[PDB]
Amino acid sequence: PKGIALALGLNAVDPKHYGGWAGKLNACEADAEDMAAIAAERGFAVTTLMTKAATRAKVIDAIGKAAKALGKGDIFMLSYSGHGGQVPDTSNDEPDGVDETWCLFDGELIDDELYALLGKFAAGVRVLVFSDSCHSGTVVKMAYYNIRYRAMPQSVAMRTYRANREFYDTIQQKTKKVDLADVKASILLISGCQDNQLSQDGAFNGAFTGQLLRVWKNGLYKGSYRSFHKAIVRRMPPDQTPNFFTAGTPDPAFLKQRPFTV
Amino acid sequence: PKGIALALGLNAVDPKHYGGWAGKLNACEADAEDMAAIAAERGFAVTTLMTKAATRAKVIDAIGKAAKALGKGDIFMLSYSGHGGQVPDTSNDEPDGVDETWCLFDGELIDDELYALLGKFAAGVRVLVFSDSCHSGTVVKMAYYNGIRYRAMPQSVAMRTYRANREFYDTIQQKTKKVDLADVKASILLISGCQDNQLSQDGAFNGAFTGQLLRVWKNGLYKGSYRSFHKAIVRRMPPDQTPNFFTAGTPDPAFLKQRPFTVLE
Amino acid sequence: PKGIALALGLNAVDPKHYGGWAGKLNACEADAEDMAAIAAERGFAVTTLMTKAATRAKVIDAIGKAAKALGKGDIFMLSYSGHGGQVPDTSNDEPDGVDETWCLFDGELIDDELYALLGKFAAGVRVLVFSDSCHSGTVVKMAYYNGIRYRAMPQSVAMRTYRANREFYDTIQQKTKKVDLADVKASILLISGCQDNQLSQDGAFNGAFTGQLLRVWKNGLYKGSYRSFHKAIVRRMPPDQTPNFFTAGTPDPAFLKQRPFTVLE
Amino acid sequence: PKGIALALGLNAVDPKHYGGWAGKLNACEADAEDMAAIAAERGFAVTTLMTKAATRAKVIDAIGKAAKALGKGDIFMLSYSGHGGQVPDTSNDEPDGVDETWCLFDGELIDDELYALLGKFAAGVRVLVFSDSCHSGTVVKMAYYNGIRYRAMPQSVAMRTYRANREFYDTIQQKTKKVDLADVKASILLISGCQDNQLSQDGAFNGAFTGQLLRVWKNGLYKGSYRSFHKAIVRRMPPDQTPNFFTAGTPDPAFLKQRPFTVLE
Amino acid sequence: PKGIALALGLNAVDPKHYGGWAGKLNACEADAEDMAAIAAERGFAVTTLMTKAATRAKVIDAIGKAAKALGKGDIFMLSYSGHGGQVPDTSNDEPDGVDETWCLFDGELIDDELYALLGKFAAGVRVLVFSDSCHSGTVVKMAYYNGIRYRAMPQSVAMRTYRANREFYDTIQQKTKKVDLADVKASILLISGCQDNQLSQDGAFNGAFTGQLLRVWKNGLYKGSYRSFHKAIVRRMPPDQTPNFFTAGTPDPAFLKQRPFTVLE
Amino acid sequence: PKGIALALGLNAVDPKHYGGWAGKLNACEADAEDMAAIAAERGFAVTTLMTKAATRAKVIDAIGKAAKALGKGDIFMLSYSGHGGQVPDTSNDEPDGVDETWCLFDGELIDDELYALLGKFAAGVRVLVFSDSCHSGTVVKMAYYNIRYRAMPQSVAMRTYRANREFYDTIQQKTKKVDLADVKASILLISGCQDNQLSQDGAFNGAFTGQLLRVWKNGLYKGSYRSFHKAIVRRMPPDQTPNFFTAGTPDPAFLKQRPFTV
Amino acid sequence: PKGIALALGLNAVDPKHYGGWAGKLNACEADAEDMAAIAAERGFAVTTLMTKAATRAKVIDAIGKAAKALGKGDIFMLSYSGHGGQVPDTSNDEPDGVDETWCLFDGELIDDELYALLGKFAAGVRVLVFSDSCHSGTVVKMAYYNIRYRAMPQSVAMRTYRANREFYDTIQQKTKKVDLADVKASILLISGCQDNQLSQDGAFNGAFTGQLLRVWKNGLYKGSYRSFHKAIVRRMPPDQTPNFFTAGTPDPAFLKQRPFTV
């Protein structure tokens, strides 16, 4: 049973693309190394991409390789620590009508592009995703919240879009909204927070990742993914609750395994 | 396909059982009426139980009836607004090792008793549950919330209630074998008012969660699936209170794709 | 030139219509008396309506009378202290798509009904309106104000009141065609207690806005125009509550240049 | 050398005069009893007036008696715990142009009336005044204190009370010529509970100021002069409330050098 | 080895002695019942005194009885939930120079009176004391806590109570010679609800400290020594309230090594 | 009628004396210039001392000169913006038993040294003092307060004392507590705050000085010293109230004059 | 009667061992100098170790020397200002199950190693320990608290452990939990705060140390250790209360002496 892991960490992005914004953070590379370390110790063929290395091309290509390499019975692990972005949805005039994205160094990866990539995996393959990131969401979230968060500021989001109109418009025209519930692979997406919350960027690792490492306790943790998740949220502040989302072909055996089994 | 709904609302409980605690709230009955109103307008055979009426016997019996009545294709709806309780887990020594419960007027309904009841439903039956409640959780939750009423029974009362009814809960705890919601034949879609590390706020005219549920539902003008319904609500909710979308039992993508209160596709 | 004033103050409403909500406040009647006192001293034929007396029928009729009585050169003064309501806008599906209203004792007066009434006044008539009230607005306003009584009906009650009176408001909403305040023949000068993104505070002896209005007016010792009057008030008001200066209808620079409560230049 | 003390305490006033405001407080009578107790133990002929008893007539008359009774060498002590009022200064147009007052049960005693009364005392007589009260001041004070009861009448009530008693206060304001406390023959030592830009807190068992005064006085065990007494109190007081040490009239260094409640050196 | 326990709980005191202060609380009687319940289940001959019953005479007499009854090897348990008082230390002039006390219904029990009583116990007797109370301390504590009920009598009341009972406390203060808890023959283990610079919170169903004590004790499922018991509690307690672990008298490592409520090893 | 003014401003002190503390501030020199500007425009022979220039020797000497120069009818003006210090009072073991001081560049000037200097002025001379400074006071003040204040931190106060034991002990043995009420000159001391408060150091001038300049409005202010004071406190926050203290031979005519008359 | 004192102060540690964390502080060296100054004035043979100098080897060796040098009647004084650490307890899977430590420059000194060292002292020897430090404790403490504290952040604690797995595991296997109540020497441990609190690092000395120096008032303090302690806590904020812990052979005469007697 072969396992492939992709640890992504970006504590900076190319200001030359994000309208002068560097999206500086200082614990995302640590999160990736820590996740990659756990994956390696679990028997994963790990590949780490740090900031400059975490570009659209490399990330898309890496995930693509995995989708082709592993098959029924294998498991793909994707962890990500970086900013969460939003690109305007020209489908309407709603000011808060946007598409969530991952702020990669090269540019933004639209959630649909990622979702589609995950849909290229085999049928009996387990896909485990850790996303210690968040999104600006709507003005209401901004209202409640207004210590740095892993969310690109709305001003930069729009400025980045304007500075790259043709680029994102093309991306938006290609891939479309995919249904994660209907994909072949059994996906388990554990994110750092809820859609109405923000993810905190600590000084040595994300708030979520830090607690993930604390309950995992260097491999001494005994339990299933559900228990793993419940044990983490128990330690987390009410304003930041990691989420446990499953998509694709249901696999109760997978959700019953130990958090990083291969 | 038909439908049976059970709206529960308790803005008070029997202090004679809860060690002198009345568990007063003033929006739970409103929540139940509002949920029952939506259910009735959707073609549901609704049954409402308000505080004194929401007892262990009546609730257990009502759910029991439903499990026997409806079958493949039908749908059962359970909504609940009240306090969330905790009874000591005499299995370990952990001060915070407890069992979550619903604080009914009569006494507490251990989560296992409810889970088991839900497991008595047919195979192709959809089970929709709304729980605008919360639990004290562990001291860590209490810690964060120490620095406006919440629908959670205070830990002191939880223990006091247990002590005052030792034999009662110990018997229940021993005659109620645990069960896995991911094994029940029916398709469970549980939407609660908050996360396990959060608390649910009791508003003056309806729960924070229920209030926003009614606002997006907009008297039946809402267009969309359960997932969209849920996402639209959380979007309006404060970061310290996020309703959860939990599915258990036999997966049913068609069910999660239906309109939030659908009886007939 | 003569003058008719209508001072409205409601520090309570009929719970029998507002789904059990009394909309209690304790400074609205004081606000009306104080406004009525100034109007009387200025040469106004004042009519005061306190809570129970401030019903849909009476308010609509009083304004109606005025519109017919006074003509070119005269001036109508309308002051209001009470809750601001919202009734669902069954035209769209937007959870926050609603119509602003005044919560009268009898029920809610849709902004359109008031706007239309103001449109029934003569051409050269000055219409001065003081509204020390506010509206729940959208969830974003609720969001900012989540992190002391405000004269806005809580959203939960707004919807509950609507549901409890479906046919009543639906009829009103269909027999009241919208109107543009910038088209009315009369010169409208609307001074409200706060901005659309703010809430109006209900003090213990008069509204925050009204209290400061009386303080700058200083029992008739104030010298200046309406604009100056307004600027002097906002200067004293907290940043989270800024009264607004809105003009509609046929422009009248001479009117906005007069002394705040002038009947005779 | 002999001594006469007047302890005033009003934890309520006549709403029939203050436009329906009762000015409720619950530590002013305690303050007066405590001050009267110290005065009695110091050899003072004390007279206590509690709320209903602390009227304009009685207070004016009592102080008047004292001014006539004692002479060179004697000492008059006046302590007061109640609300501080403000009546509009109809001399200017400034919204905040007002006259400070003491809110007696009967009505307000304009600072000038008190100042004049103090000016009726002999030349070598020491006048010790304790005022555990405050004033609303201007909007700026209100501003700072917007972001626990204070002994200041709310501005709304102040104006409402004035309007409801126009002729009464206007007469007083015209028959009470202003006076300079630095001209009176007697030696005035006025110690108030707070600064002009602060507010005085009303505790549950005595004013914040009075409470600390009693604590440093420690039942007569305090050794030191008035200045030291004052410095020791402020040292314990919060930065938002600092009692003031004001001297007026004919300077008397020997007096300010005596022990805080000395009748006989 | 046998055991005698005395559970004291006062959620009110005689205002007729405390200058009109009732010292109301609503969790002290619950604390006593809960402590008495644990003691009874541990093999203790428990005696409970609730408010009116917890008088100076009864408390002094009960402890006295115990001191005479049990001997070498036995163990006395004293738990107390009520207000902590302070009576002026007429020895110095320091405004904050006072003596800590327990506010019993009848009046205050000076710490020395209690300490002396504890000194009347045998040599090999273990004395376990739980005090879920606190003291006003000095102005510095008051300072920090100025920027939710606490079991400390307010300083104002403390002085007022003293003045109202001058002769009473002065007599007590002169007939109660001080004593050193580190000299008593018995082994004292005093566990209080907070530190000398902190205050103890009075919850709605039991003290903050007592509530957590019951939570770690988990109805007798707790395994460990007194030190571990204490460490497990403080771990759950907020930083502004840390229960203390104080030992006095003849050291007894075997005692501090026993299980928190051991009568028979 | 001759007037002499001394504007002192120290937005730094010698760390070589204050146990490594520089007592940095950035509005004290501005306060002095502003006060000196008003004094000059009022007919004052002004002398300004900025930080390095405001030493014990120079300040003592300047005030001394003035005391000898002017006489009956004249007026001396002293303004000060800097930190307020405290040196332990070895008269007892009280932890908070200390002597207030002005933190001059050279070292601390004990309040008694200043008070004594003020007592060297003629009988009919008016002494106007502005002190936009404060003192740490006792732990209770620290309690209520715990944006920078013009008060030397208690740790530095003690450290400075220890590092200069003989120096301050000698000073403490020489001059003693003086009675400001019995001095010949009529003194009016207006400080930035009360004894139980702290004085705020703004970015361009002290909180107190800033408001002093605002009511003075470039010489357009009409009124007496009392009115001047009342108008300022009216604008000041409740946590900072400037004080109006008079000492020496009473002079009602002086307190009745315009805030900076000569 | 000979006395030996060891003043330790670390306002930095080796990032090369603490996974890149420098554990910067700026008042720990001041605390040590101040404590060493008091000790010297009391007749103590003081030895000061500042940051780079406060290594595992030197500290262990210094304390060892003392244990051998002094005997019945003498007194050893140990003061420490630095970060408090925690190393995972592999005895179980508890996420918060850890061992408290002192973050020395070289690495962490497990509480057991220190406790054992203290147990090597004679029978009639008095051991006085001042620890102006704290520990992260459990998530509940973190919850209540979330101005810098002297506690190593949990993320760094785990990262440091992982980066030195073999090192700490070996230490954990050697020394074990010791009973401070049964040691020969009479120990008095006065720490800066309670187990459920954190110790504040001031700008010129710890919050605790600063108040210790204030009540001590340069040797003018009269009283016993208990009174000394009570006088300090009286001045301290409720969120930080120094503790008075006694272990080993009881010595009422010792606790009755003046705070720094020899």
What is the separation of C-alpha D22 from the centre of its chain, rounded to a whole number of angstroms?
19
d(CA G252, CA G100): 29
Q: Shortest CB distance from B234 goes to which of A181, A195, A234? A: A195
- Cβ distance B88 to E218 less than 8 Å, yes or no, reads yes
Which of F191, F194, F211, F256 best probes binding to D when mutated, by most D CB atoms within 10 angstroms? F194
d(CA C23, CA A56): 56
Shortest CA distance from E146: residue in chain D: D238
Q: Which residues contact F222 (CB under 8 A, 6 or more apart)?
A: F258
d(CA F116, CA F183): 9
Residue owning tokens 């606490």: E150
C155-164 helix and B208-217 helix, angle to the nearest 10 degrees: 50
Using a 10 angstrom Cβ sphere, with 0-12 exposed, 13-18 middle and 19 or more buried, the burial of residue E171 is exposed
d(CA C135, CA C122): 29
Shortest CA distance from C38: residue in chain D: D163
Q: Look at residue G27 and give its three-state secondary structure.
A: coil
Strand E45-50, strand E3-9: pairing: parallel
- Cβ distance C219 to D163 less than 8 Å, yes or no, reads yes
Size of interface B-C (CB pairs under 8 A): 49
CATH architecture of B1-265: 3-Layer(aba) Sandwich (3.40)
Element at D141 (helix H, strand E): helix D139-144
Cα separations in angstroms, B39 against B77, B186, B219, C96:
8, 20, 11, 22
d(CA F1, CA F14): 38
Residue owning tokens 């010489």: F219
Paired tokens of G236 = 């301290």
Paired tokens of E175 = 């007939």
Query: Quick check: E25 and E39 in contact, CB under 8 A?
Result: no
**Which residues lie across from G109 on neighbouring strands?**
G102
What is F1-262's CATH number, 3.40.50.1460, 3.50.50.60, 3.30.930.10, 3.40.50.720? 3.40.50.1460
d(CA C126, CA C123): 9
DSSP state of B152: B
Cβ contacts (< 8 Å) between C143 and chain B: which residues?
238
d(CA E156, CA E170): 18
Using a 10 angstrom Cβ sphere, with 0-12 exposed, 13-18 middle and 19 or more buried, the burial of residue E219 is middle
Using a 10 angstrom Cβ sphere, with 0-12 exposed, 13-18 middle and 19 or more buried, the burial of residue E89 is middle
> What was the elucidation method?
X-ray
* DSSP letter for each residue of chain F: --EEEEEEE-S---TTTTTT-----SSHHHHHHHHHHHHHHTTEEEEEEEGGG--HHHHHHHHHHHHHH--TT-EEEEEEES-EEEEE-TTS--TT-EEEEEE-SSSEEEHHHHHHHHTTS-SS-EEEEEEE------HHHHHHH--EESB--HHHHHHHHHHTHHHHHHHHHHS----GGG-SSEEEEEESS-TTS--EE-SSS-HHHHHHHHHHGGGT--S-HHHHHHHHHHHS-TT---EEEEEES--HHHHHS-TT--
* Residue G224 neighbours by CB distance under 10 Å: 15
The residues spanned by each domain of chain C are 1-265
- Cβ distance G204 to F156 less than 8 Å, yes or no, reads yes
Q: Of C251, C212, C43, C69, which is closest to residue C130 (Cα–Cα)? A: C212
Using a 10 angstrom Cβ sphere, with 0-12 exposed, 13-18 middle and 19 or more buried, the burial of residue G256 is middle
- Cβ distance B219 to C157 less than 8 Å, yes or no, reads no
Helices (H) and strands (E) in chain D, counts: 9, 11
* Residue C248 neighbours by CB distance under 10 Å: 20
Query: Quick check: F110 and F171 in contact, CB under 8 A?
Result: yes
Cα separations in angstroms, G75 against C61, G125, G243, G250:
96, 6, 20, 14
Instruction: State residue D149 phi and psi, 5-degree precision.
Output: -100, 140
Touching chains, E (3+ CB pairs < 8 A)? B, D, F, G
Query: Quick check: A219 and G89 in contact, CB under 8 A?
Result: no
Q: Shortest CB distance from B95 goes to which of E205, E215, E238? A: E215
HSE-up (13 A, CA, CB side) for residue F9: 21
Paired tokens of C209 = 């806005």
Cα separations in angstroms, B254 against A112, B260, E114:
22, 12, 73
Query: Quick check: E151 and E132 in contact, CB under 8 A?
Result: yes
Q: Shortest CB distance from G93 goes to which of A222, A235, A237? A: A222
d(CA D191, CA D80): 11
d(CA D39, CA D45): 8
Q: Of E206, E235, E213, E178, which is closest to residue E77 (Cα–Cα)? A: E213
HSE-up (13 A, CA, CB side) for residue G124: 7
d(CA G42, CA G36): 10
Q: CA torsion, points C240, C243, C249, C253, in degrees to nearest 10?
A: -130
**Which residues lie across from G110 on neighbouring strands?**
G101
Query: Quick check: B191 and B129 in contact, CB under 8 A?
Result: yes
d(CA E118, CA E179): 10
Which of C89, C96, C98, C156 best probes binding to B when mutated, by most B CB atoms within 10 angstroms? C156
Q: Shortest CB distance from C163 goes to which of B37, B222, B238? A: B37
Strand E187-192, strand A44-50: pairing: unpaired
d(CA D79, CA D48): 10
Size of interface A-B (CB pairs under 8 A): 63
Q: Shortest CB distance from E236 goes to which of B88, B92, B139? A: B139
Q: Which residues contact E167 (CB under 8 A, 6 or more apart)?
A: none
d(CA G127, CA G74): 9
b/e map E192-209, b = 16+ CB within 10 Å: bbbbbbbbbbbbebbbbb
Residue owning tokens 């570009």: A55
- Cβ distance C160 to B30 less than 8 Å, yes or no, reads yes
Element at B256 (helix H, strand E): helix B253-257
Cβ contacts (< 8 Å) between C88 and chain B: which residues?
218-219
Query: Quick check: B6 and B79 in contact, CB under 8 A?
Result: yes
Breaks (C-N over 2.5 A) in chain D follow: 147
Query: Quick check: D242 and D209 in contact, CB under 8 A?
Result: no
- Cβ distance D242 to F196 less than 8 Å, yes or no, reads yes
Position G25: which residue type?
L
